[PDB]
Amino acid sequence: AQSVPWGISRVQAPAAHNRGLTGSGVKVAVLDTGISTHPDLNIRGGASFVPGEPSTQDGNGHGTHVAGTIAALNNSIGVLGVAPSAELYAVKVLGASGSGSVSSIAQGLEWAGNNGMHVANLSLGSPSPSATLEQAVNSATSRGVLVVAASGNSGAGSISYPARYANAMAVGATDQNNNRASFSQYGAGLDIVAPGVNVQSTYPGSTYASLNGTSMATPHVAGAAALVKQKNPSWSNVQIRNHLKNTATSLGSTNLYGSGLVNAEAATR
Numbered sequence: 567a568q569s570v571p572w573g574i575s576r577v578q579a580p581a582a583h584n585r586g587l588t589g590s591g592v593k594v595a596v597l598d599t600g601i602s603t604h605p606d607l608n609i610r611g612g613a614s615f616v617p618g619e620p621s622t623q624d625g626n627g628h629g630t631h632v633a634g635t636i637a638a639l640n641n642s643i644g645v646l647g648v649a650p651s652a653e654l655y656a657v658k659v660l661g662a663s664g665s666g667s668v669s670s671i672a673q674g675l676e677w678a679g680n681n682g683m684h685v686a687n688l689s690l691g692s693p694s695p696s697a698t699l700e701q702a703v704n705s706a707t708s709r710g711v712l713v714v715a716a717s718g719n720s721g722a723g724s725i726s727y728p729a730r731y732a733n734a735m736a737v738g739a740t741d742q743n744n745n746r747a748s749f750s751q752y753g754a755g756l757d758i759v760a761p762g763v764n765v766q767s768t769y770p771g772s773t774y775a776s777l778n779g780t781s782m783a784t785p786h787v788a789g790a791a792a793l794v795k796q797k798n799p800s801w802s803n804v805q806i807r808n809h810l811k812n813t814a815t816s817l818g819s820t821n822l823y824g825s826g827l828v829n830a831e832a833a834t835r
C-alpha cells in the first residue's frame with residue numbers, strides 16, 4: 567500500500583498529478599549525502615564530489631529522504647513525491663557524517679549546470695557566506711538551473727547561505743497548523759515555505775522514516791518547480807521561481823514566510 571505524507575497533500579501535489587503533471591522530463595539534482603537504491607525511487611544518474619566516497623549511495627539518510635519528498639514513485643508501495651516522475655540525480659556533496667565543504671558543494675552545482683539539470687535541491691547551508699559557493703550558485707543559475715535551498719534551522723530572523731543569495735530560492739519550514747516551525751530561519755531573502763515537521767519519506771535500508779527541518783521543506787518546493795516546468799517547458803528558472811511565489815498562499819508577513827505556502831495546484835492551474 568502507498569500512503570501520501572501530510573506535506574505532499576498540504577502542498578496540493580495530488581491535484582497536479584490528477585492533471586497529468588508528475589515532473590516527467592524534468593531533471594532534478596539532489597545535492598546531499600547521496601541517494602540510496604530504494605524500491606520507491608528511480609535514480610537516473612549522478613556524481614560524487616566527496617573524496618573517499620566515490621559511490622553516490624547514501625551513508626547518512628538525509629539525501630535519500632530529501633529525494634523521496636521530491637520524487638518517491640507513484641505505485642502501490644511506500645510514499646509519494648511531489649513530482650513522482652522527475653528524473654532524479656544523486657549529487658553527493660556531503661559525506662556519511664552529513665558534512666562536506668564549500669568546494670564539494672560548488673562542484674555539485676557546476677555538475678548540475680554542465681549536465682542539464684532544471685532544478686537543484688540544496689537542503690544544506692551555513693550561517694556564513696562563501697565566495698566559492700556563491701560563484702557556483704550564480705554559474706548554475708546562468709546554465710538554467712533553479713537552485714532551491716533550505717533557510718536553515720537556527721530559528722533566527724536571518725537566513726543562512728547559500729539560501730540567502732539572490733540566485734537561490736530560499737525555503738523555510740511550516741508545521742501542520744501553517745505556522746513557521748520554531749527552528750525555521752526567516753528574514754531577508756526568504757522566498758517561500760513548505761512543510762518541514764514530521765515529514766515521512768524514503769530512507770536507506772529500503773524503509774521509510776520521518777525527519778524535521780528546513781531540509782524537508784526544500785524538496786517540496788523543488789518538486790513543485792518540476793511540476794511547473796513540465797507544464798511550461800519553455801520557462802526559465804526565474805519564471806518558475808516567480809510563478810511558485812506568485813501562486814503561494816499567504817501565511818503572514820513576508821519577513822516570516824516569504825510569499826507563503828507553496829501550492830502546486832495553484833501553480834499548475
Ligand SMILES: *S(=O)(=O)Cc1ccc(C=C)cc1
Nearest residue numbers: 689690691718726779780781
Ligand atoms: S536539514 O536536515 O534540515 C539540514 C540542514 C539544512 C540547512 C542548513 C542551513 C541552511 C543546515 C542543515
Ligand SMILES: [Ca+2]
Nearest residue numbers: 639643644645
Ligand atoms: Ca510509492
Ligand SMILES: [Cl-]
Nearest residue numbers: 578579580581
Ligand atoms: Cl491536492
